[PDB]
Design a protein around this ligand. Structure first.
Ligand code: COA
Ligand code: COA
Ligand code: COA
Ligand code: COA
Ligand code: COA
Ligand code: COA
Lengths: 157, 156, 156, 156, 156, 156
C-alpha cells in the first residue's frame, strides 16, 4: 500500500496548498504520482501542458514525485500504476460530503482503490486555485499563493 | 395531500438513488407524478426527450407513477395537477439548506404547496447523476449506478 | 404507509415548530401518534408526565392525533403500532447528517421502518426547545415560541 | 473604521435580502458604498449598467449610501476609498467557510481590510438572487422578492 | 448603533481568538462591553469571578473596552446599555446556523437588537476555549493559545 | 511517517466503523497503535479497562496492531512512541471542521505530528458509538454494529 500513491487534481494552477499535500504525502509513499487531469468540462484557465509543466517544476525538489497528465478515469489510471491509494487534501473549504462521495465512487470503479486525506499547513488552509485565478484575472498580485518559480508564467498567461 | 405527490428533477440521467425515492414515495401517495424539468440553465448531458424516455422506462413497474416533462414553474405545475406536495430526496451530498430555501420559495409561489423528504437506501446515499455523467463522459462503466432499463441508452 | 405515522421527540417543551410538524403530518396520515420519549439521558427540564400533558393540551384540536409516552426503542414502538413511517421535522439548525444516520439506524432495527421529513413554517424555522428552556431558566418571556395552551404550565 | 464601509456584490438583481443588509450597515457607517462588481466570470442575467441602475433606484431613500460599479479588485477599490471594512450578508444558504476564505483573501490583498457580517431579517433569510433569476427565467412573478423600484425594470 | 457594542461569552478561558474579536470590534464601536455570562448550564472550568478577572487582565490595553459579568438574559443587559448591537466572532468551527438562530432569538426578545459578526486572524481561526481546557486538564502547555497575562492563572 | 501510526479514540464501544479504519490503516503502516483515551470528561458508558479489553479482542487478527490505554495528552503519547502520524476516520457524521481544528491543535503541541484520514466502508459510514450506546441502553440488539467478539461484553 505504501509503495505508491496518486495525488490527482486539475491544478489550475498549482498552489502553495497543493505543494503542502505533495510534501507530506511524498514523505509517506515510496513513490508519489501527481496526476494532472485534463478536466475539459471545467474550463481550466491554464492548458493541460502549462498545468503539467508548472507542477513538474514546482515538485523538482521532491525526488520520489513524478507528475503525469491523464485523460481517462482516475480509477483506471490507478490500475495501470498498480496503485491502491488516492491521496486528497482536506482544507477548510473542502466539500467533505463530496469527498466521501468521490471516494466511494472511485472504489466502486476499482474495488482495491482507497482514498487517504492529508491536511495542508494552517497558513494554507484557506488557499484555493479559484482565488488565484480571480486575483490574476483582475490583474492583482497572487504571488503569495503559489510557488515563486511559476508565478511569472501565471501572472502573464 | 395523500392523493398526489410530484417528484421533480432534471434526471440527467435517472439513477438508482432517484428510483429508491420513487419506490418509497409511490408507496405513500395514491398517484405519483415524476416531473422532468427542462433545466436548460443547467446544461444537461441528455435532452429533455431522452430524459423523459429514460424515466418512463425506469418506472414502468410502478403502476401508480406517471412521468411528465415540464417547461415552466414547478409551483404552477403543482397547481395544474391540483397537488399540494412536492417530493424530494435527502442524500449525503444533498445541500440541506438549499432544499429548505427551495421549499420556502415554492411555497411563496404557491401557498398550499408543501415539500416532503424521503431517504434513498443506504447503499445509494452517495450516488449522484453527476457521477454517472463523469463516468459516461470518460467512456467508463456506470451500469452499477442506474436502472438496467436505461443503460443501453446512456452507454452507446 | 399512509395508515399511521409516528412523530417522536423529547418535546421539552413542545414548541410552535413541533406543532407545525404535527399540523402537516396529521394532514398526511390517517392516524398520527405523537410519541414522547422519556429521554432520561438528556436531562429534561420537564418531567415525562409534564411533557405528555403539555403536548396533549397543544394537540387537542387535531382529531386524529394521539399522544403517548414511551420508555423503550422507537423501532419497537413502531412495530407495536404496525407503523412503517417515522415523521421528523427539518429546521435550519437540524443536523442533517445525524438525521440520516438515525433514519438508517432505525431501519436497521426494524426493516420496514422509513423516515419521512416535513418542514415547519418559515417564521418557525429557527425555533428550538433549547431556546425556550434558556429563556425560562432566565425568567424571561417565551410565550412567542410555544402554543398558548401550555404557557401557564411552563411559566412558573 | 466607522467612516466608510463597502458592501460589494454582483446584485443580479438586488433583492429584499440585500436591501436589509444595506439598511443595517448604512445605520452603522457614516457612508456606505454599495459596490456592484462586473462579475463577467459569473454570467449575470442583467448587464453591469442595469444592475447599477436597479440598486441606485432601490437605495434612493438611504441618504448616506452611494452606489458605484467596479471592474477591478475589490481590495484595491477599498484602498481607493480609504475603506478598512467590507460589509457582507449572512443568510441561511450562505457558504460560511467560503465567506471566511474570501475575507482572508481580501486581507492578504489589502492588509487593512476587515470583513464584517450582518444578517437580513428572518423573513428574508432564505431569499437569493438565483431564485429571482429562476422565477424570471420561467416567466413567473418575483415581485415579492425584490424592491418595488426595480420591478418595472426587471420586466424589460 | 456605532456608540456601543456588547461582545458576550462564557470566556472559559479567554483565548487569543476572543482577543482578536475584541481588538476588531473595539476599533469599530465608541465603547465595547465584554459581557461574561455565568453559563451555569455549561459547567465552566473557571468560576465567573476567575473568568471576569482573566478577561479584565487580557483587555487592560484596550482603553474603550469594559468587562462585566451578568446573570440573566443578554437581551435585557443590552437594554440597560441602550445597546443595539451584539458582537459575535465567526471562526472555522463556528456553528453557523446556530449563530443565525441565536441572533433571531435575541431579536425576538429585544426588537432593537442586531447581531454583527467579526473574524479573528487566520492564525487563530481554529482556536477554541474547549481546546485550551483539554490541554490544561491534561497538564499540557496551552501558552500559545491564550493571552500571556492569563497563563500563570490557568496553568497546570 | 510510514513506520508507525497511532489511531486514538474513546472507543465507547469500538464499532464496525472503527474496525474498518484499523483494517485500512494497519495495511498502510508497519505498526499501528490503537490508543484508547480515558476521556473521563465524556463520562463513557464503559470503563477504560473495559474499552481497552474490547479493542484488544476486536484487533486480535491484526498482527501489527497493539492497543494501549492512555491518560495524558495524545501529542505526548505520539512523542513517547517516536510516532509522527495520527490516524483518524472520516464518516458521514464527522465534524469535519472540528477534525481540522484538532489536527492543528495536535501539531501545535507536537510540531512534527501530522494527522491522516481514512474512510470506513460505505456500509459502515453511518455507524457511531453513540448509536450503539442508545440501543444497548434500551436492551436492544446492537450485534449488527460491533465486532461479534465484543458483543457479549456490551449486551445489556
Ligand atoms: C481531477 C479530479 C481528481 C478532481 O480534482 P480537482 O478538480 O483538482 O479537485 P476538486 O475538483 O475536488 O477541487 C476543486 C478546487 O479545489 C481547489 N484546490 C484543491 N485542493 C487545493 C489545495 N490543496 N490548495 C489550493 N487549492 C486547492 C481549487 O479551487 C480546485 O480546483 P478548481 O477551482 O480549478 O476547480 C476528478 O475530477 C477526477 O478524478 N477526474 C478524472 C475523471 C474521473 O475519474 N472522474 C470520475 C471520478 S469519480
Ligand atoms: C428541477 C428542480 C426541482 C431541481 O431538481 P434537480 O436538478 O434534480 O435537483 P437539484 O437541482 O436541487 O440537484 C440535483 C442533483 O443532485 C443529484 N440527484 C438528486 N437526487 C438524486 C438521487 N436521489 N440520486 C442520484 N442523484 C440525485 C444529481 O447530481 C442531480 O442532478 P444534476 O447534477 O444534473 O444537477 C428545480 O430546478 C425546478 O423546480 N425547476 C423548474 C423551474 C422552477 O420552478 N424553478 C423555481 C424553483 S424555486
Ligand atoms: C426521542 C428521539 C426521537 C429524539 O427526539 P428529540 O430529542 O426531540 O429530537 P433530537 O434528539 O434529534 O433533537 C431535537 C432537538 O431539536 C429541538 N426540537 C426538535 N424539533 C423541533 C421543532 N420542530 N421546533 C422546535 N424545536 C424542536 C429540541 O431542542 C430537541 O432536543 P432537546 O430537548 O434536547 O433540546 C430519539 O432519542 C429516540 O428515538 N429515543 C427513543 C429510544 C431509541 O429508539 N433510541 C435509538 C434511536 S436510533
Ligand atoms: C462581487 C463579489 C463580492 C462576490 O459577491 P456576490 O456575487 O454578490 O456574492 P457571492 O459571489 O459570494 O455569492 C452570493 C450570491 O447570493 C446573492 N446574495 C448575497 N447576499 C444576498 C442577500 N442578502 N439576499 C439575496 N441574495 C443574496 C449574491 O448576489 C450572489 O448571487 P448570484 O451569484 O446568484 O448572482 C466578489 O466576486 C468580488 O470581490 N469581485 C471583485 C473582484 C475581486 O476582488 N475578486 C477577488 C476577491 S477575493
Ligand atoms: C453567553 C452566550 C452568548 C453564549 O456565548 P459562548 O458560550 O461563549 O458562545 P457559544 O456558547 O455560543 O459557543 C462558544 C464556544 O466557542 C469557543 N469560543 C467562542 N469563540 C471563540 C473564539 N473567538 N476563539 C476561541 N474560542 C472561542 C469555545 O469552545 C466556546 O465556549 P465553551 O467551550 O466554553 O462552550 C449565550 O449563552 C448567552 O447569551 N447567555 C446569556 C443568557 C441568555 O440570554 N440566553 C438566551 C440567549 S438567546
Ligand atoms: C480521544 C480523542 C482522540 C477523541 O477521540 P474520539 O472521542 O473517539 O473522537 P471524537 O471525540 O473526535 O468523536 C468520536 C465520536 O464519533 C463516533 N466514532 C468515531 N469514529 C467512529 C467510527 N469510525 N465508527 C463508529 N463510531 C465512531 C462515536 O459517537 C464517537 O464517540 P463518543 O460518542 O464516545 O464521543 C481526543 O479527545 C484526545 O486526543 N484525547 C486525549 C487528550 C488530548 O490529547 N487532548 C487534546 C487533543 S487536541
Amino acid at each position: 500500500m505504501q509503495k505508491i500513491g496518486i495525488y490527482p487534481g486539475t491544478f489550475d494552477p498549482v498552489t502553495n496548498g497543493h505543494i503542502d499535500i505533495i510534501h507530506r504525502s511524498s514523505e509517506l509513499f515510496e513513490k508519489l504520482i501527481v496526476a494532472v487531469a485534463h478536466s475539459s468540462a471545467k474550463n481550466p484557465m491554464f492548458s493541460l501542458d502549462e498545468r503539467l509543466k508548472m507542477i513538474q517544476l514546482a515538485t523538482k525538489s521532491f525526488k520520489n514525485v513524478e507528475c503525469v497528465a491523464f485523460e481517462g478515469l482516475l480509477a483506471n489510471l490507478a490500475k495501470e500504476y498498480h496503485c491502491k491509494v488516492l491521496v486528497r487534501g482536506l482544507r477548510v473549504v473542502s466539500d467533505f460530503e463530496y469527498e466521501l462521495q468521490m471516494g466511494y465512487a472511485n472504489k466502486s470503479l476499482n474495488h482495491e482503490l482507497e482514498t487517504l486525506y492529508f491536511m495542508p499547513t494552517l497558513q494554507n488552509a484557506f488557499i484555493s486555485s479559484s482565488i488565484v485565478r480571480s486575483i490574476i484575472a483582475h490583474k492583482g498580485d497572487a504571488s503569495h499563493l503559489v510557488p515563486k518559480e511559476i508565478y511569472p508564467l501565471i501572472s502573464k498567461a
